[PDB]
């Protein structure tokens, strides 16, 4: 691997995608991983106790931390965000600090570093660089896009070797319901459909389907996402963008169906047939240019995710329970 | 006028466009104007000593000021920026604070105000709401676009009655060379081609043309811009965008030629013929929907601007001279 024996920074490295990227980097034989993470939406147990892992429990927007940074990194993965859509809507200023300003202050610091081979930014999901002012359901979605603007600017103006990796609907081990601090809404606990469904199935309760589960999504397993981020780092064109995607869609009804089959959850599912009006990212560029393919099936990824959830269920419950009081008063 | 007897806030109201908008608002018989301006790129003499004008010499990002704001405004004009392209490139963080965060914190505060009929945002120049990640020569240009994203979001999510007014190449009385603090580069003094040309012509010196002055621009007189902003306030569709534009292009060679004719500047101009490759915003929407037309000719506007510059030349020179030391060491 081009990443063997390298020094890498993972901003947001204690998070869901981050922690899995860190695991993989260590597997690939990196020299050092510097995790920078304020634990706003993460648990310390998702960092490793590793001699190669240095952990700064600090915001990447902290001026002292930024000024302390040395030109000793080959690669930077910028994965920090304000998790997620619902939280951002609740408090756009909390989102801005942890989602927009993060990227700007990081790049501003990194712009004169010469050891950097690649700076990989996790963007929201061929690849086009045209955007509408009207997309944008949340401050979160806007912050993600702003990070792409910054990634293009810093490349053009300062030759910062940025690569934007667009993904969506990641799932897998290491996504903990209720991870971090209360960010204003029940989505702090119920972060995403897949871990919510897995948790509820493991507890033997009915999976709540919205509108018969007709919505489809391209789910991608987190270990494929980690490998895709690494491919972007190694071989992605500076200034460029790649979809990191499975190219396969699964209905929420089928997601639920599979989670129930795997867990043994015997409870009813109110599912409806999908109609053309219910749903009216290509992986080709990454495949062709980076040799990257996200090949873990929804069935295999779900099994792995459920296995991890089962093994860590008590810990996850203790973490969920810290938000009981905020949940009850929401 | 719909603005007669209203309470209006002008963020950035001590500036070039702002001060002229304030003058016009007072002419239209507004009840109160609250100018909020940190004077970062403005002079106090551009505010009026008026019983109707309240001046807060404070950033619009100041938390105390924001929390102090009352639901007592009919109209808000958000004209603050970090002046301008060159400065923003020099210090993207200074730009962010005074160009991106300004809009976000303002809107976040204004979002539950009920007396607001319109919030008018000065954007950078039919009207489309699709943008490229690759436009964007500066952090300034990105901040302007981000403000449009915010203006659309806050309208959709919170019914904030935003109107984006896109203009460019404003000129006229009240633009003072060297206004405000040093923002890192000589552009602090030499702000824009028109006042630079007028100042130099009045001093009897050769106007410096770049590449024979083949570049063309749609110049618009500041009093037309003020009236256009007022039309947006009165009649602009919430969530909407309008070009505020003359629809007429002038070459920098012709700009220079006219300034020399008006001032009597007898010095040479190195001008070249414009070729098709030298230059390879429609006013129709504003005309049709708002009854607005920017009809002041380049010849008439230049005369008015030169007259004002002549009358205030000593004051402008004293203001320019404060940057002598920063100029000499740049
Ligand atoms: N999971 C998905 O389906 C998905 C989809 C598209 C894009 N993304 C992007 O992937 C990246 C990782 O997201 P995730 O799903 O792992 O969520 P996450 O919340 O688990 O991870 C983000 C991490 O950023 C950290 N963080 C927040 N503010 C910080 C700050 N100021 N300084 C340093 N760290 C800070 C959090 O504590 C957390 O560990 C994000 O940039 C996100 O927007 C995720
Ligand atoms: N003049 C043009 O050709 C042009 C073209 C397109 C758009 N605009 C836009 O028009 C608006 C006015 O620009 P201008 O040309 O009058 O420049 P300007 O610099 O004279 O005015 C901007 C004002 O904002 C103030 N300001 C800066 N930071 C502030 C803050 N944090 N809080 C409150 N006030 C702050 C400055 O002190 C200044 O008075 C801007 O939004 C600008 O981006 C101007």
Author numbering:
A (entry chain A), B (entry chain A): 8 to 132, 147 to 301, 306 to 355
Share the article's original sentences.
The abrogation or reduction of O-antigen expression as a result of wbmF, wbmG or wbmH mutations implicates all three genes in the biosynthesis of this molecule, and is consistent with the hypothesis that these three adjacent SDR genes catalyse the UDP-d-ManNAc3NAcA to UDP-l-GalNAc3NAcA conversion, which is probably required for O-antigen synthesis.
This extra loop extends over the nicotinamide end of the cofactor-binding pocket. His6-WbmG and His6-WbmH copurify with this compound from the E. coli expression host, but in order to stabilise the protein in solution His6-WbmF required the addition of exogenous cofactor, and this is the most likely source of this molecule in these His6-WbmF structures. In these structures, the bound cofactor is buried within the core of the protein; in the case of the His6-WbmF structure, the 14-amino-acid insertion supplies an additional occluding loop, further blocking release of cofactor in this conformation. The SDR triad is conserved in WbmG and WbmH as TYK but in WbmF Ala131 superimposes onto the Ser/Thr position. In GMER these residues are Cys109 and His179;21 in GDP-mannose 3,5-epimerase (GME) they are Cys145 and Lys217.12 In WbmG and WbmH these amino acids superimpose onto hydrophobic side chains, but in WbmF this catalytic cysteine is conserved (Cys133) and there are two candidates for the basic side chain, Asn213 and His90. This is strongly suggestive of a functional role for this residue, since such conformations are rarely observed except where they are required to place a key side chain in the active site.
